[PDB]
Amino acid sequence: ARYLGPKLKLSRREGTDLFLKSGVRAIDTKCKIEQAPGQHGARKPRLSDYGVQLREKQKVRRIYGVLERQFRNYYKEAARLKGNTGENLLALLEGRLDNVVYRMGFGATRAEARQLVSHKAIMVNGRVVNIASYQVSPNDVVSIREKAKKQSRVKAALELAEQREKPTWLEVDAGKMEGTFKRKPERSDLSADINEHLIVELYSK
Amino acid sequence: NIKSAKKRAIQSEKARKHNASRRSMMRTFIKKVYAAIEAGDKAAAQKAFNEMQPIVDRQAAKGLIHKNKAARHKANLTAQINKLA
Amino acid sequence: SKEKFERTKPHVNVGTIGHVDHGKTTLTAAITTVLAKTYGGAARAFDQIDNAPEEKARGITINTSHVEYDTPTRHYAHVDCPGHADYVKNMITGAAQMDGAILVVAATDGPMPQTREHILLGRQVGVPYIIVFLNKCDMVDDEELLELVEMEVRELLSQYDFPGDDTPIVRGSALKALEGDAEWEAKILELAGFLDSYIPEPERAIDKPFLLPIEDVFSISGRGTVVTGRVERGIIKVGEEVEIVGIKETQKSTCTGVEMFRKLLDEGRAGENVGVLLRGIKREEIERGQVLAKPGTIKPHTKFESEVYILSKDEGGRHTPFFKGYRPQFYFRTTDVTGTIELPEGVEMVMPGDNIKMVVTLIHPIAMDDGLRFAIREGGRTVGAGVVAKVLS
Amino acid sequence: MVTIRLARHGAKKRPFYQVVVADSRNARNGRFIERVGFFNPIASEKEEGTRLDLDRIAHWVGQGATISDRVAALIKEVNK
RNA sequence: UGAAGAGUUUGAUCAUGGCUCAGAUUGAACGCUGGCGGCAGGCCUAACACAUGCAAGUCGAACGGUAACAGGAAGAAGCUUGCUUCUUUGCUGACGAGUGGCGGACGGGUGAGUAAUGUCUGGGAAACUGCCUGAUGGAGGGGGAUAACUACUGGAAACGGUAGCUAAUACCGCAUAACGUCGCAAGACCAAAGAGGGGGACCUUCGGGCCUCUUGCCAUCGGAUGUGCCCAGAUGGGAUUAGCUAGUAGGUGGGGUAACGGCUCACCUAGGCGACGAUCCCUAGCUGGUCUGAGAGGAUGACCAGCCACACUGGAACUGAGACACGGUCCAGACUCCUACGGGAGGCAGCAGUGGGGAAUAUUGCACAAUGGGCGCAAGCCUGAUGCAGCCAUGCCGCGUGUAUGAAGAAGGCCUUCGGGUUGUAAAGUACUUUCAGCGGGGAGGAAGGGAGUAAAGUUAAUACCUUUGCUCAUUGACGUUACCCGCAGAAGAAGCACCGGCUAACUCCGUGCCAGCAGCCGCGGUAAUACGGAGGGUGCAAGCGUUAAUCGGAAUUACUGGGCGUAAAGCGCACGCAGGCGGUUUGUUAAGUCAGAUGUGAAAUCCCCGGGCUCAACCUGGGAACUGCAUCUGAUACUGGCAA
RNA sequence: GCGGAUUUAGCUCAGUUGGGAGAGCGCCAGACUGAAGAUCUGGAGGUCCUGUGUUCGAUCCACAGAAUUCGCACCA
Numbered sequence A: 001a002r003y004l005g006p007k008l009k010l011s012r013r014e015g016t017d018l019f020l021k022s023g024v025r026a027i028d029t030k031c032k033i034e035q036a037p038g039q040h041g042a043r044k045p046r047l048s049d050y051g052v053q054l055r056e057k058q059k060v061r062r063i064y065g066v067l068e069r070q071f072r073n074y075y076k077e078a079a080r081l082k083g084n085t086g087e088n089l090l091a092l093l094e095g096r097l098d099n100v101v102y103r104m105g106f107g108a109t110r111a112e113a114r115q116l117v118s119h120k121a122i123m124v125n126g127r128v129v130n131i132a133s134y135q136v137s138p139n140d141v142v143s144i145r146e147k148a149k150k151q152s153r154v155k156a157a158l159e160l161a162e163q164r165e166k167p168t169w170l171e172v173d174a175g176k177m178e179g180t181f182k183r184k185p186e187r188s189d190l191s192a193d194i195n196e197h198l199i200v201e202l203y204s205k
Numbered sequence B: 001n002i003k004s005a006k007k008r009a010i011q012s013e014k015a016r017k018h019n020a021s022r023r024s025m026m027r028t029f030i031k032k033v034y035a036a037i038e039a040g041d042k043a044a045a046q047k048a049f050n051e052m053q054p055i056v057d058r059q060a061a062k063g064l065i066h067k068n069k070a071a072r073h074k075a076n077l078t079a080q081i082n083k084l085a
Numbered sequence C: 001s002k003e004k005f006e007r008t009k010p011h012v013n014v015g016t017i018g019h020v021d022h023g024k025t026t027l028t029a030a031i032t033t034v035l036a037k038t039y040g041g042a043a044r045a046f047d048q049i050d051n052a053p054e055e056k057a058r059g060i061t062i063n064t065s066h067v068e069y070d071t072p073t074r075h076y077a078h079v080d081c082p083g084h085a086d087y088v089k090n091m092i093t094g095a096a097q098m099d100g101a102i103l104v105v106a107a108t109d110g111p112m113p114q115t116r117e118h119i120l121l122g123r124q125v126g127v128p129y130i131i132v133f134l135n136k137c138d139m140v141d142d143e144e145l146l147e148l149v150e151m152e153v154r155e156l157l158s159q160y161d162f163p164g165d166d167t168p169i170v171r172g173s174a175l176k177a178l179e180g181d182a183e184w185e186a187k188i189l190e191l192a193g194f195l196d197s198y199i200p201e202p203e204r205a206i207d208k209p210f211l212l213p214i215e216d217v218f219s220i221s222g223r224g225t226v227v228t229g230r231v232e233r234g235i236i237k238v239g240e241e242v243e244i245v246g247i248k249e250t251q252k253s254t255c256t257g258v259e260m261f262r263k264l265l266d267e268g269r270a271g272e273n274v275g276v277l278l279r280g281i282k283r284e285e286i287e288r289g290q291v292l293a294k295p296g297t298i299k300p301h302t303k304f305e306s307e308v309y310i311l312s313k314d315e316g317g318r319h320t321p322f323f324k325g326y327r328p329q330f331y332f333r334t335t336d337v338t339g340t341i342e343l344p345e346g347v348e349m350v351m352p353g354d355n356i357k358m359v360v361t362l363i364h365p366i367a368m369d370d371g372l373r374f375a376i377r378e379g380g381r382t383v384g385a386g387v388v389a390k391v392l393s
Numbered sequence D: 001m002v003t004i005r006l007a008r009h010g011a012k013k014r015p016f017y018q019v020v021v022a023d024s025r026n027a028r029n030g031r032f033i034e035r036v037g038f039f040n041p042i043a044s045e046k047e048e049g050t051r052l053d054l055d056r057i058a059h060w061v062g063q064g065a066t067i068s069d070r071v072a073a074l075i076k077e078v079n080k
Numbered sequence E: 001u002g003a004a005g006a007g008u009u010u011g012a013u014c015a016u017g018g019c020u021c022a023g024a025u026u027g028a029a030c031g032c033u034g035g036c037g038g039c040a041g042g043c044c045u046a047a048c049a050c051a052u053g054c055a056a057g058u059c060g061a062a063c064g065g066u067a068a069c070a071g072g073a074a075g076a077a078g079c080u081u082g083c084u085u086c087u088u089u090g091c092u093g094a095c096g097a098g099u100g101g102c103g104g105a106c107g108g109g110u111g112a113g114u115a116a117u118g119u120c121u122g123g124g125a126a127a128c129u130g131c132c133u134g135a136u137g138g139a140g141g142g143g144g145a146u147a148a149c150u151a152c153u154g155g156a157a158a159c160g161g162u163a164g165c166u167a168a169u170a171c172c173g174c175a176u177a178a179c180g181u182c183g184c185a186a187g188a189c190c191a192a193a194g195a196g197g198g199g200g201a202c203c204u205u206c207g208g209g210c211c212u213c214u215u216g217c218c219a220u221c222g223g224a225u226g227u228g229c230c231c232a233g234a235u236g237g238g239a240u241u242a243g244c245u246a247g248u249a250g251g252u253g254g255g256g257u258a259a260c261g262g263c264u265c266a267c268c269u270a271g272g273c274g275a276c277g278a279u280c281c282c283u284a285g286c287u288g289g290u291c292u293g294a295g296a297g298g299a300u301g302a303c304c305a306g307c308c309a310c311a312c313u314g315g316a317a318c319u320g321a322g323a324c325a326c327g328g329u330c331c332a333g334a335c336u337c338c339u340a341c342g343g344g345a346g347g348c349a350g351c352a353g354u355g356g357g358g359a360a361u362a363u364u365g366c367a368c369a370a371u372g373g374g375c376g377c378a379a380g381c382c383u384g385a386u387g388c389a390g391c392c393a394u395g396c397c398g399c400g401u402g403u404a405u406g407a408a409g410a411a412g413g414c415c416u417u418c419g420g421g422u423u424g425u426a427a428a429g430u431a432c433u434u435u436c437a438g439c440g441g442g443g444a445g446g447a448a449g450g451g452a453g454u455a456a457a458g459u460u461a462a463u464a465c466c467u468u469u470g471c472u473c474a475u476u477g478a479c480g481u482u483a484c485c486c487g488c489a490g491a492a493g494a495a496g497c498a499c500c501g502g503c504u505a506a507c508u509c510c511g512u513g514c515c516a517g518c519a520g521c522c523g524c525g526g527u528a529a530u531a532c533g534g535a536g537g538g539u540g541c542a543a544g545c546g547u548u549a550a551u552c553g554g555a556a557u558u559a560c561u562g563g564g565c566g567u568a569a570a571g572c573g574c575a576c577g578c579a580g581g582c583g584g585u586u587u588g589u590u591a592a593g594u595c596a597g598a599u600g601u602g603a604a605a606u607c608c609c610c611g612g613g614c615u616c617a618a619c620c621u622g623g624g625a626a627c628u629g630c631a632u633c634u635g636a637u638a639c640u641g642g643c644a645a
Numbered sequence F: 001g002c003g004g005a006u007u008u009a010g011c012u013c014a015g016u017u018g019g020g021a022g023a024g025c026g027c028c029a030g031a032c033u034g035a036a037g038a039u040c041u042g043g044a045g046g047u048c049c050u051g052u053g054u055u056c057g058a059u060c061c062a063c064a065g066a067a068u069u070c071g072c073a074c075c076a
């Protein structure tokens, strides 16, 4: 499913925000965040092992918007390559169009970044798409269209873009609403909350 | 029953009783040689060998001896007389 | 394979009713071969080899005959309608299909049970014209008998809620006629003129949404599953989607033909008895009493407040005051299902001759719409006549 | 019997044809003798979607086996 | 680039060992729920029985012809008069039927039979092979026919019988006779078919002969391809299946097949086979492969490809290069149907449909566009092969059902020392967007070809023809207003399903009270149930979700990899010994086992390695490697085996 | 559509058949423990399948319906 529900309520028991309605707000601003989303359908305790072990598996899973199947499949291409299995996986996960656009400042929210690509206002190269996954690669060209240098939603997401460092492996152009995905990601510096060893144990039978 | 040329069946009625007679004329002549073999004769076995020699030959040219039988069946009946000789 | 027919002249549904004895079965056959000489005729015919298995088997005077014919006046579809006690339930619906009924009553006898019954069943929700036939007038030899009997045929009509004020009365003997007794055959030609004089023609709307009762459901010897009926209103163009809204089942089905007795139509319009053809769905999966309809029609319901008129015992009807906890049977269209009386407060006891609004709980939902006319029978006779005042879930 | 022929291996509403020498007693998708070519009718730019050999379309056509109209017209346009 | 365990016996504990769960899967079914779209799959059972429709023809360029249609001509009419109308005529288009040739032996379907000289792998030798194709040579001259047709004549039909006539690339002679065949040799013996276009010089009784081309025909020897035949090896299970075999085993000579063969026979011999499992019994189509799995292995054989086998039942033969011909024949049999009651007719395991069975599996749809297949020297015709459409969440994949912002945080619930907490930025409220559906409007592409003209630089006649070449022109689209593209309003039209006692992530409040009920296992409930029921809430998955069945995995718990036997499950009560398995030590030899190398082959598909093409992905696809293997060819001699000492 | 035949305490079956509902089991209660048994003491238990009609009176008779079963009937 694409969700469509109460973003920030998740934050509470996520114990992290991970970009839920970022633009003016984050934790404990006009919202009740860092609680438990139950009265006593769920409330804080010591935590189980297996809790953690499931939660973190979903941590990595949710900040791309990938379904059940997909992320496993990426694992079946990684453990088919003779290179690093850990690296490869997070490499394939960032090939999704929706993730790339957010990191070119297009969308102030992860959900919003993916809700751009939906309405016809995106394109890649001279090709028009409306597909939230694509093959994104070195020296591609991320392109805004005509009647998307016209929408007042897009502009209103450049605000936050001035407030996020933006990656160094892509050119980013907001002045003509382009930017190229000129070279491969670095994850020498995004594995900072990601322990690959954990998840790949679990996936294994 | 419906066939495009179910007439094919009737056509073969003709060509199965034509063949028939040619072959059984050829089989009466083989019986005539064998007559003379039990007489010890080279003068009535050979009134029935060279007389079926154009027969046997011209019927291989109607294809009615067939295939590698028809490169064999002018030697098969040659064989006969040679024992007796 | 199969043939062609087309919609030529207006197609008027008629039938033969009565009680047992009478003309009935003999008149049905009689009429058609007489008329067929005079208003039909075609050479190297179907008819003359294939005498005449299909009719004995597929009907018995159950509800229907699949005769189509044009008369030079109109088109007549005759449906042969019960007048045996054993089928009384069926006959309400058949006359409900009817547009005129040939009421054969033998002039030798008086009103018999089914002769009174029918005229009373007619007026309410069935046939609006009665065409009286005194039969057995080669066994009545005296005009003074005839006269007398006629005068009591008047009296039935005139207060069983039809004009008794004149009806064309056709007077002959059935079994005599057919064989070659010319004096009655002549009269048979006058029946296509009394189907104009007295009726003359219905006005049906074909531009409504679809609606059709079940008549008969088949699973044919080599084609698929067929459902028959008289299109009530609306139309069925060949190749279609339909929805069959009904009892406890709602079926979706696709329509892939609409013959008229293996003589193919490209429509099925109102007033026509037709066959229909479907892909999908086998015959036992179709229950009787569902209506074939568009995908657009209302859904079924159980409960509804109603407006019913309690009839009196003189014209048939209740004669004991009655309470909550009765089980009367509701005919809506094709078939019936039991519904119970419950009376919104300020009412518990309901007498002969009342009017009343009461809230129903039928023992199954049946495809329901406001205004839907009905009869209410218990003990096999009408308690009241009513309409669905306000559907509820 | 064996003949030069084309032979779909495309999916639905994809016309990817492969020129095979294949049997008429099995089929064009059945028993092959051999491939011999690839062909695009749509003239795709993919890696080697057109092959048609010189050596077997000059040896099995020696002892006879006929080609197809697109092929006939292709001999000239690869200038073979 | 390659495999993890947990729970469950006991008062406690450690082993042993069963049990269960977490995985992955399906031609799956079921229950609930259901927005779109792309790609794939879809009667597994009663191989039960079937209405109907279709799936098998085409060549006039071999024929004799003219039944219909349309013109040409011809006389004629109307003189409905130079225009309507009527008869005649095969002349021409064109073609009914009938003779003649080739297809109908294919393609398609099914897995019932079938443990298999059937399949698979690998070899082999005594064969065939129309369609195909190379070379050389030929096609000479006669005869007898018979369909149609015609005149009669029998039947309800099916379906006939007389009598007469005639054609051919039909039939049968006769001639000619090798690089032919047979024959040691000497010798002997055998073939046919022409039809088409065109034409200058000549000839004709004016039909044609003459000439030139073209396709087709005949023969002989090859090649290709495809196909018979043999062998070895591998192919399932049961000794509560141990004895088997008379063309049986073999040998002669006969006969037969295309060819090798007891294939078959006469005679002769009396053998042959077997526990390295015969004989018999159970069950099964087989394979590439498929699924799962770290692997080995096990399981399995759906779609797709190959092989084999079957077509109402049984049996049988005909023509042919090819058939025991699914929609050919005949005979017998049971069915089934019709009838003029005399007699006939039929076989969906072909497609689509029908009924019955079953848990379950779709429309009597459109079409020659395209691909392929058939007939034909061509044009052209034919196609339930095929391409499309349709129906079904049967599955794989993609996208959507909105984004932002918004609080004392709205009522409204729910829980609550009654302070509040929770639902909750969720809503209301504010702006912002219209994908996709819906509406209106364009629209690429899948088409190459063939057809009408023109160039030949061939061939001959120099010209034709025919073929060839480019050009020139009008066009070839079934799907379907296709991909796609533009506009049009308006959050609009688009979430569900299971679970929350432990394994296992995810609880409260009530009602019930060992009842009701729950439950994969371990197990729940006896009136203060995190396990039952409802509500509130929480959790995981999401146009699906959950349940079942089923196969492999975990399970190294059948173990070659990878298991035990004092007491846990297991050592015959004990010797002897036949087969079998096993062999101290040294030398010589051999090279079978074995080691090395080489060479074929190891189908396509499939995996992988590298790499592309569709808007992505699904899907499509190229090249390399793999193809673990097997046989063959040659070497090596340490070990294993043989031989010798 | 059309014809038969049949439903009596929670369970197992009587009964009238124009006249007024039992037995057996099994409950449920008061008693012992928390509950239950063993056992102890007390009580309760039918729209007579359903709905009508008749009569002072229907579970009985008569008629409509429902559900079970058992026979029939249907190729536009």
Ligand SMILES: Nc1nc2c(ncn2[C@@H]2O[C@H](COP(=O)(O)OP(=O)(O)O)[C@@H](O)[C@H]2O)c(=O)[nH]1
Pocket (backbone or CB within 6 Å): C019, C020, C021, C022, C023, C024, C025, C026, C027, C083, C135, C136, C137, C139, C172, C173, C174, C175, C176
């Ligand atoms: N004499 C006489 N007999 C008749 C006549 N009409 C009918 N019948 C016979 O009476 C029978 C019954 O009459 P019919 O109306 O057909 O009755 P149903 O089928 O019993 O309703 C027929 O079937 C005939 O045998 C009549 O007009 N005259």
